[PDB]
Amino acid sequence: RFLKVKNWETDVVLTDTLHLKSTLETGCTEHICMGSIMLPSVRTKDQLFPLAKEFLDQYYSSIKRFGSKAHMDRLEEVNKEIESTSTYQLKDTELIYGAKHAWRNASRCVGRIQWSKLQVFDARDCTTAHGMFNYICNHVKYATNKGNLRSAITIFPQRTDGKHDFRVWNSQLIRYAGYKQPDGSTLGDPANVQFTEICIQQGWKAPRGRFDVLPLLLQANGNDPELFQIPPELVLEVPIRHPKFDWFKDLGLKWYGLPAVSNMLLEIGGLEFSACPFSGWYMGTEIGVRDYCDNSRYNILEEVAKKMDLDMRKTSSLWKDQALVEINIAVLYSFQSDKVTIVDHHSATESFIKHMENEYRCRGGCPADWVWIVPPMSGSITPVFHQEMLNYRLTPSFEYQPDPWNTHVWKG
Amino acid sequence: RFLKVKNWETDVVLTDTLHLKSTLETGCTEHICMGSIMLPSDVRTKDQLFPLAKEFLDQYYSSIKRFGSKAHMDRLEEVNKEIESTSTYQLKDTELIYGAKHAWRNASRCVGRIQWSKLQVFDARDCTTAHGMFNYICNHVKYATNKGNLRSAITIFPQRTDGKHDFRVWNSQLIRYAGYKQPDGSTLGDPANVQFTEICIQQGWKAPRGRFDVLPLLLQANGNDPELFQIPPELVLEVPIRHPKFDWFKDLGLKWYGLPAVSNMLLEIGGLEFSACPFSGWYMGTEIGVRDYCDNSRYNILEEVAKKMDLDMRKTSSLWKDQALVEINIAVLYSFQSDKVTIVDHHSATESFIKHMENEYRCRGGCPADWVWIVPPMSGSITPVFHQEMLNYRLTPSFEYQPDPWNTHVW
Numbered sequence: 001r002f003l004k005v006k007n008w009e010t011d012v013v014l015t016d017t018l019h020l021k022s023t024l025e026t027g028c029t030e031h032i033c034m035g036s037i038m039l040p041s042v043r044t045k046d047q048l049f050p051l052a053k054e055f056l057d058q059y060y061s062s063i064k065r066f067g068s069k070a071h072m073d074r075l076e077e078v079n080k081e082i083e084s085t086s087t088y089q090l091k092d093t094e095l096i097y098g099a100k101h102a103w104r105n106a107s108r109c110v111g112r113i114q115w116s117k118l119q120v121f122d123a124r125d126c127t128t129a130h131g132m133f134n135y136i137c138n139h140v141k142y143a144t145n146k147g148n149l150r151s152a153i154t155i156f157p158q159r160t161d162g163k164h165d166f167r168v169w170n171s172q173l174i175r176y177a178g179y180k181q182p183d184g185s186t187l188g189d190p191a192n193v194q195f196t197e198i199c200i201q202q203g204w205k206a207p208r209g210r211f212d213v214l215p216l217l218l219q220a221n222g223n224d225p226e227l228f229q230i231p232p233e234l235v236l237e238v239p240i241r242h243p244k245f246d247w248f249k250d251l252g253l254k255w256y257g258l259p260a261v262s263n264m265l266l267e268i269g270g271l272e273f274s275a276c277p278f279s280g281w282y283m284g285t286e287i288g289v290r291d292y293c294d295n296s297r298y299n300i301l302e303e304v305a306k307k308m309d310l311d312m313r314k315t316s317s318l319w320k321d322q323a324l325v326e327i328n329i330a331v332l333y334s335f336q337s338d339k340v341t342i343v344d345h346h347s348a349t350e351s352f353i354k355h356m357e358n359e360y361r362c363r364g365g366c367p368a369d370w371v372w373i374v375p376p377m378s379g380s381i382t383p384v385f386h387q388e389m390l391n392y393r394l395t396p397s398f399e400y401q402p403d404p405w406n407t408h409v410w411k412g
Numbered sequence: 413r414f415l416k417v418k419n420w421e422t423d424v425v426l427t428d429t430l431h432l433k434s435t436l437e438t439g440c441t442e443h444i445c446m447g448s449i450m451l452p453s454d455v456r457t458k459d460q461l462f463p464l465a466k467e468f469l470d471q472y473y474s475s476i477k478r479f480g481s482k483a484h485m486d487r488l489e490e491v492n493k494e495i496e497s498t499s500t501y502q503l504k505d506t507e508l509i510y511g512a513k514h515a516w517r518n519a520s521r522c523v524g525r526i527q528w529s530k531l532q533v534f535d536a537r538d539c540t541t542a543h544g545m546f547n548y549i550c551n552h553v554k555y556a557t558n559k560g561n562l563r564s565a566i567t568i569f570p571q572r573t574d575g576k577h578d579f580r581v582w583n584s585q586l587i588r589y590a591g592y593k594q595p596d597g598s599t600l601g602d603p604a605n606v607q608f609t610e611i612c613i614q615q616g617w618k619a620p621r622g623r624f625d626v627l628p629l630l631l632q633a634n635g636n637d638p639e640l641f642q643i644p645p646e647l648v649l650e651v652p653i654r655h656p657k658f659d660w661f662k663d664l665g666l667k668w669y670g671l672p673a674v675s676n677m678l679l680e681i682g683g684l685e686f687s688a689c690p691f692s693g694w695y696m697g698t699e700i701g702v703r704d705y706c707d708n709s710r711y712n713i714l715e716e717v718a719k720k721m722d723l724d725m726r727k728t729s730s731l732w733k734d735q736a737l738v739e740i741n742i743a744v745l746y747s748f749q750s751d752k753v754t755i756v757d758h759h760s761a762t763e764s765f766i767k768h769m770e771n772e773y774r775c776r777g778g779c780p781a782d783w784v785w786i787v788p789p790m791s792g793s794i795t796p797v798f799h800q801e802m803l804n805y806r807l808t809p810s811f812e813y814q815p816d817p818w819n820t821h822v823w
């Protein structure tokens with residue numbers, strides 16, 4: 001079974017064979033497309049061997065050693081261990097390979113041209129929340145690299161009986177607090193109101209400002225989570241200024257430099273790593289379009305447009321569109337001026353097209369989620385808009401998991 | 413299998429029950445989503461056709477509160493006998509109108525479907541020649557344009573009978589600008605219409621030498637060779653493109669036509685196939701300003717506009733492209749609005765569509781919708797539809813694509 005995708009701007013045609021190796025499901029059927037559904041969706045060892053064998057077959061193929069004595073012994077080894085312990089342990093090399101390919105397989109990620117250059121931190125010997133805090137400080141320091149950002153992931157011990165999970169309760173390692181005011185307004189990031197309240201309940205002394213960096217809330221071995229303050233000197237931030245508009249600085253905006261997602265689940269050969277924070281660097285629109293201009297976030301369009309003196313009572317003046325562009329210019333300008341790594345959506349999407357084509361040629365495909373790959377502004381003037389993409393799920397992978405405060409059994 | 417869609421900007425959740433009636437396929441499977449493929453992939457035998465007819469008549473008679481009525485049963489009986497008789501059947505006027513409105517209601521890629529029930533249907537089933545097709549099309553155009561106060565319309569030519577005698581409009585839209593080869597190996601016109609614009613000449617057109625030249629109609633009646641007709645220029649409403657602030661904008665020489673009228677699709681109702689069924693509404697601003705003007709495969713005026721704004725074009729990070737794109741789209745809206753010609757901005761139209769969705773979920777139990785096509789090509793996430801989960805599925809009656817005539821026409 002072969003599959004063709006077309007670029008409608010360049011008429012480049014590529015052929016997908018990689019989708020044949022696709023195990024998991026999409027959520028779609030031949031009678032319905034769930035391509036715009038945000039999230040569509042305790043391991044017995046009946047299920048675990050095949051998943052382990054498949055991963056190991058992948059691994060030893062990638063290293064030129066399929067069918068080798070080393071390949072066969074490792075299979076036998078892992079089988080014995082699953083027989084004996086109902087789970088198994090990855091070698092370091094397998095772990096690094098798994099984590100890189102999870103990224104490579106991440107069909108929603110436009111930054112995947114960088115997948116081979118992931119720094120993998122093995123935190124599988126960690127046992128306490130304090131140890132978790134230490135590992136995460138080191139991740140942050142390393143990844144930030146004084147503004148010259150480096151991709152990294154830190155991998156905490158895998159799930160066992162599901163009653164001893166390691167979880168980072170933060171959705172991101174660095175994020176701003178949100179406070180719901182009595183009058184209904186929100187101070188700070190509305191996306192984080194719920195988590196902020198938990199932290200506050202857990203004993204966090206909230207500064208109650210508009211850009212308070214949240215404390216880490218860390219759960220080790222299924223114990224109750226504990227609060228830690230990331231040392232402020234480790235949190236790199238950028239004041240947002242505009243290159244031509246001088247009043248922009250007076251909006252009092254800033255953002256943090258390091259995007260580090262910490263609530264996803266890393267799956268490798270059937271093993272589940274429930275705490276595996278990973279980080280890269282920002283695409284400008286993440287901050288300028290979504291974080292700042294989503295109505296459910298900081299929502300600064302009107303104030304910006306107000307100070308641009310735009311005609312704001314006629315939507316067909318496109319005053320929203322006009323302000324959106326200036327804000328994104330300011331985000332890019334600020335990061336570059338402070339020499340903090342950032343990529344504009346034009347450069348990012350162009351790179352991904354080059355990546356995708358390369359992946360089709362050396363790998364036979366590259367699973368891609370159009371709905372997420374196309375930037376949140378300026379869609380059709382980026383080349384991904386005009387690119388047909390096949391979406392399918394490969395392992396190793398990053399998966400969503402439910403919020404820990406919903407499932408956690410509290411010890412007290 | 414009673415599905416939920418969530419809006420992540422408002423937490424509004426809708427329950428979809430309508431998808432269960434879906435007939436055709438999507439392109440997707442368990443193992444692969446083809447949601448972003450532009451085009452997922454001879455007449456019908458006689459009880460391929462009756463179940464098709466029955467399904468249609470059931471929903472038609474259900475729609476008028478007469479399901480299970482003897483008038484319903486009589487119509488099924490009548491169509492059933494007409495079917496076994498003639499290897500086909502003919503729609504009642506009422507059925508034809510219902511079918512056309514619902515083909516629009518069911519177009520999952522269309523953002524403007526809140527207007528679906530106010531469609532002017534022109535029955536052209538008595539047409540026999542390309543000259544008659546031309547007459548019907550001029551009347552469609554004059555009616556739809558309405559001196560700038562645009563009105564939705566569809567004109568329906570005779571149904572396919574078996575591929576023998578297909579009626580086809582060879583243009584992709586009733587009104588489009590010529591795109592020719594040229595010197596330099598450059599392109600003058602609309603590059604998108606290159607191939608078509610000299611098939612016109614390949615057939616006898618002689619072209620006015622410009623870029624914004626309205627193409628001639630190329631009409632095929634009863635499977636015959638297609639004929640050339642020029643739409644009377646006084647029927648073709650065009651809008652000069654100026655900017656409300658930048659007065660150099662006029663010098664680019666930009667204009668666009670008022671009437672978007674798609675003419676190469678196939679309308680399917682109760683198994684019957686209408687290969688010539690041009691339909692029209694009015695533009696959303698971004699279709700012209702973002703796609704028609706700024707696509708690299710189209711008029712691609714970005715560089716030109718940026719230069720005169722004297723923007724920093726040395727590298728992508730200045731977002732000069734983005735800045736110009738917005739100004740270009742402000743102008744289109746401005747020009748159309750000032751010439752009192754109908755147009756909707758992408759903010760208004762997407763807001764309309766959200767209201768439309770809530771209407772369809774409430775009164776109909778769902779609204780099929782293709783997120784990839786509904787989200788505007790600029791300013792995606794500041795329109796409400798970006799944050800709207802949508803389910804895509806195929807309902808009938810429908811508008812479908814069909815092969816380009818010049819490939820299939822036994823010449």
Ligand code: HEM
Binds near residue numbers: 278
């Ligand atoms: C190095 C620069 C990187 C850039 C510019 C980048 C960019 C992006 C963007 C724009 C998204 C869309 C998500 C959103 O808009 O909220 C995304 C999603 C994603 N990225 Fe990347 N990324 C980078 C690195 C990484 C790394 C290092 C990993 C993992 C090790 C990764 C894994 C993912 C995953 C799993 C998603 C899907 C998130 C979800 O479905 O919720 N990315 N990326």
Ligand code: HEM
Binds near residue numbers: 522565694811
């Ligand atoms: C009245 C105002 C209308 C507006 C504002 C509107 C808007 C749009 C837009 C923006 C698209 C996206 C396609 C593209 O970007 O090329 C579209 C597609 C479509 N529209 Fe509507 N439209 C309108 C009227 C109509 C009418 C009257 C019909 C049929 C009677 C119709 C049927 C369709 C169909 C079938 C598509 C999908 C085309 C395809 O799949 O290639 N529309 N429309």
Ligand SMILES: Cc1cc(CCNCc2ccc3c(C)cc(N)nc3c2)ccc1C#N
Binds near residue numbers: 039259261282286
């Ligand atoms: C369910 C959900 C999911 C998400 C995902 C947002 N984060 C995705 C992501 C994940 C990793 C990234 C990385 C690693 C870098 C980067 N620049 N951006 C990244 C963005 C956002 C909101 C919601 C909600 N509600």
Ligand SMILES: Cc1cc(CCNCc2ccc3c(C)cc(N)nc3c2)ccc1C#N
Binds near residue numbers: 451691693694699
């Ligand atoms: C296969 C294809 C399809 C399309 C779709 C273009 N037509 C869509 C359409 C169809 C009808 C419309 C109508 C009726 C109004 C309006 N404002 N916009 C409309 C837009 C464009 C390019 C290709 C190609 N190649």
Ligand SMILES: C[C@H](O)[C@H](O)[C@H]1CNc2nc(N)[nH]c(=O)c2N1
Binds near residue numbers: 373799
């Ligand atoms: C409803 C829809 O799936 C949702 O709004 C998606 C659309 N595409 C996206 N794309 C990116 N990169 N990030 C997002 O959060 C979303 N949200």
Ligand SMILES: C[C@H](O)[C@H](O)[C@H]1CNc2nc(N)[nH]c(=O)c2N1
Binds near residue numbers: 385388389450786
């Ligand atoms: C490959 C992709 O499907 C293609 O570029 C689509 C994307 N979305 C679109 N959306 C609209 N409204 N019109 C289009 O032509 C397209 N083109």
Ligand SMILES: [Zn+2]
Binds near residue numbers: 028441445446
């Ligand atoms: Zn799908």
